[PDB]
Amino acid sequence: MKTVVFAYHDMGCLGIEALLAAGYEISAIFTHTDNPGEKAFYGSVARLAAERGIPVYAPDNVNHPLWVERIAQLSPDVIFSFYYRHLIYDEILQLAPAGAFNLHGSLLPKYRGRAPLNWVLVNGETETGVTLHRMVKRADAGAIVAQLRIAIAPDDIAITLHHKLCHAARQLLEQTLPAIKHGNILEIAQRENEATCFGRRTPDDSFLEWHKPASVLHNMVRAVADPWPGAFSYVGNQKFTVWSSRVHPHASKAQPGSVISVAPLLIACGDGALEIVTGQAGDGITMQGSQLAQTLGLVQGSRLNSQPACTARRRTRVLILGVNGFIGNHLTERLLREDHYEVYGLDIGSDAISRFLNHPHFHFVEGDISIHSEWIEYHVKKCDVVLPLVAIATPIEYTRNPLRVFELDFEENLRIIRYCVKYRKRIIFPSTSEVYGMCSDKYFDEDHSNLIVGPVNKPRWIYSVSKQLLDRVIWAYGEKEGLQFTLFRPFNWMGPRLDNLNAARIGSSRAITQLILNLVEGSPIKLIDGGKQKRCFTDIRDGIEALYRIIENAGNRCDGEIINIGNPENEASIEELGEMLLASFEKHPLRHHFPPFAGFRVVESSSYYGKGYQDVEHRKPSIRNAHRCLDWEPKIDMQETIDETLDFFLRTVDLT
Template sequence: MKNRAVVFAYHTIGCTGIESLIKAGFEIITVFTHKDSPNEHIYFESVAKKCAEHNLMIFAPDTINTMKWESYIAELNPDYIFSFYYREKISMNILELAKIGTFNLHGSLLPHFRGCAPLNWAIIKGASETGVTIHHMTDRLDAGEIVAQQKIPIDINDTARSLLHKMNIAAELLLDRTLPKIKSRNYVTISQQESQASYFPRRKPEDGLINWDSNSLSIYNLIRGVSAPYPGAFTFYKNQKIIIWEAALLTHNSQNDKNSAPGTILSTDPLIIATLDGSLEVKSCQIESLTDSNNTPITNIWLNGNQLAKHFNLNRLDKFGPVKNKQEKLKTVLIIGVNGFIGQHLATRLLADGNYRVHGVDINDSAIASLKNDVNFRFYEADILLHKTQIEFLIKSSDIVFPLVAIATPESYTKSPLTVFELDFEANLEIIRHCVKYQKRIIFPSTSEVYGMCNDEKFNEENSNLIMGPISKQRWIYASSKQLLDRVIWAYGSENQLQFTLFRPFNWMGPGLDSLELARQGKSRAITKMIANLVDGEPIALVEGGLQKRCFTDIEDGINALIAIIENHNGLCDGQIINIGNPENEASIAELANRLVNAYVSHPLSKYLPKPLPIKVVDAMDFYGQGYQDVDFRKPDISQAKNILHWTPEIALEQTLKNTLDHFLRQAVKLNKNQSSYEALK
């Protein structure tokens, strides 16, 4: 066997990966890399030069995920596909061309620090260790089974540069140890624990702005986490940008005037700046666009803290901070219903992004308690039916409003229709009117159910008719409320009184979808109810045989779409209705139940729980009561989302199902008497 490999590589780690493959005896048949950006400081080794040294075929396309390159790689018939710091996500169409396996080298100890810039984020978040991981590539970024890992300790004095050096050494050690095992197929993989996963977005140079209202350690970690060769952490004195490359944590407070506001200069020699809880000493910095006596820009002038103070003639009690009236302040996103399924995931993602302040409203904080330590998060315990004055004040104080509060379960539609109308229509109508009054942008969640009994093969935002069932079918009171609100919002928008985007989430699923307790009370979605049946030793009940088909969408895909709507590049989302669903993940409720049972049986925690009972079929009247009606299918047309948001769902139903089940089984076993067994397993 020749062990033919197609390689995707960039950066110094990419060069290390190529050398390691050659050393291990793999035949590299083609390498794909990136063109160096003229706007980026290139501090790392060139994969193109490395390929020239070894006479390897190399390409640098703008994008790899095209039919042209799929066909080319298919003709190569590779045994393996390897990725080393390649910056574009590789499609499953390409990954499936590898006959034996696909392997990626990621710069963290997965499942921690998934996503972009894991090295920088590890320092910024104050981690004491990180590492490198070799894992299988799947349709989810950095989520495949782990093949091997190498830990790297992070010292309190480590910077991005020193950690990068450590990481390259660790990558070489890990590859040299693991590639022979991959070649001989003599290795064991372990699944990633989704409950331990953390995802971080790509960092931009502007993310380096120092918030002096943070504590000293957080600012210190930011400075060393984005220090050279990265763009650097920065602040402003008046209108002049200053990049701080190196700082020192002070071990005493003798210089610190406790009455000084964060950002205040406490000393000029050495240069010491007040923070929220102490102070930092500036050791090395750079003035961007310093000018001489002829007003000619002089660049790359590096100074120590005292030299900086002399240049600006700084005095004690002068202040550093953002440029007044020039720095864009953090936008405030108000999430009404933040403790709910979408609310908790959206708030978590916005806070991780770092560009938003989140105000969350709900009647409790059980799902988002961990967010309350974030300086950019404020939680308000309130009921929109009771605390109307407070809700109005919060809308007035926000930039973007997400009203996510709704009663959205079939039991409620049929058994408490007036309560559904009061909350889902009347209370939300008040929120819309406040947004009009205070000129706030609203992003409103309609649902796929506004389509009612529509028979279109694919539901289109612009053209599909919205059809309700007979008046006696109270099941549609929720859909009618949502549809009427859509029309009210559209009417306000057509008169230029409201900036809005409507989004329709098609059967989003994932960890945190309802709760087992709500499922036991009959107040949850179908998937959570099924899981509750399994953990309680009850048979899953399929209404009318579970023949209805739905298109299930992973919450991570859904949140990615919402982030694009919030960012609203060039205002393209204004006045739009956007379906957010996954047409490829269509399955009947019966099929979903059978897949769930199979996943449950194979899950390691199921041995602490009851064995599944046979699935039973129930009558809709017996299960939901009078007034229930449903549709056979509900498939979205997502061309609008693709064109406006440049968004395509990526996560397969099987993976979403596993993640959701794992989340609830860990909760169930933790609450079970087998506490010690669970902890041992964990």
């Protein structure tokens, strides 16, 4: 049974040991590089592989096509995933005829996601275990083959429960491996009704809220105990960590937050009183509770703030360097109305944001990014996040004046980026979907797909390369100077506010606008290049909700990443014309508008126009934002997008 193993940690080591005990012919193991700064309390899968002689590798991204090809040449039979920190997609899972089996450390479907141990300790559970399950596209949604359960005593700590989970995993694997080897696989369906998916946890959660019950706080301390970072508490402006505490009787005659005794140290809670047995302050050694209290200096009566008041987060400031435009005036809608957010804007007009000019926390300044460099420089130092949504996307400027796609697109954005590395700020740079050019890779991946452009003599590729080198400068700046950034690529964001430009000027960014123009002045539907090409659009609400939580960095999950905000689904070649009459069934006028005839131009021969147009609408990967971070699946539909864009466009025209 030539098998492929993705292993790490003690679970990975024990899985390799059990697989070799059972007699699996492991072809190769994929592991992770050593953690830069951590505690080496767990075994090394790489060392185990080296001793056993099985070849081991640590790819940066195992989902690259090259590694899939290597695995395929390895001729997999079954894939085993023992505590792999990364995610493996169907590209690899389909190379195993027997399939892929993942070993999770929770009683599935309860406590899905990452770090089941710490999470079940936070909520104070008393019965967990290990579970082997199938691997599908939805992570942790496979039929349970075997599932052992072990009990948690109140004295159990992180390392003890880790050891118990490891032992339970060994016992489970001993009675399951022969079954898989001989083809006996049992399938117990996961109940989605009782499924809770807990995401990744960060030290920021380790704050000890004193208004919470003493028992809950005790579970919080024991969840992240040695050798985990530990509890997080603050006295004044000094951090101290609780390594061991126990709950005291709820009976008390003191107010919440008042320390009742320092020897031994005992703090009060909303109900109950936590007693700090062992603690450590800042960067030092763990002292006694009384010693810790003496070192900190708090005495009987002193109250400690549960969280340092950073002026109620001070309303994180967003500097949008184009607002009157399409993306800017919708993101401004999203973060002004909903949530607190303070936003500063700078464009050459206020036509689209006239409903925010008198808003309490919107600071608009008219200007240009070329004459008002002083204003921008001052407002990158004062603000917190920067979004340069200045666009030169018009092809007319590509072809007529390519010396303006450089002095304004490249040179000015480069100046703006260097304001964010000088003042240590965060820049969310809008990349384009044109960086891929004429790439032919089905899905335009963010980290696997190649970028193809035409020769130098074509002056229309200077925008793709100018905006492609700006992403390679932000990446370089974020590795040598630690610039905090995020690169989002909007493919086909369309919605009501896109552009008018007196019938799109000559046709720049035409898309659907010319079709709406046809639906008013009795014009036939022209079929350029025969209309065979399919197009996939994206509702502006979807992109804005996906871009809202790029600013709202959840646990700093994807910083220094690239996110393609598009709809791989929602394809429309002829269905584009389908919902024209039927979608327009809620019309209140029911008068004139002269329903245009369905013009048909099936003539394929277009050699006079010339080949090389290249389909503008190509598939997005939507994988680094769908589940990995931002947890963003494009829900909407294909219906309401058009059914609202057409209505708004018609309402904006006075006509009669």
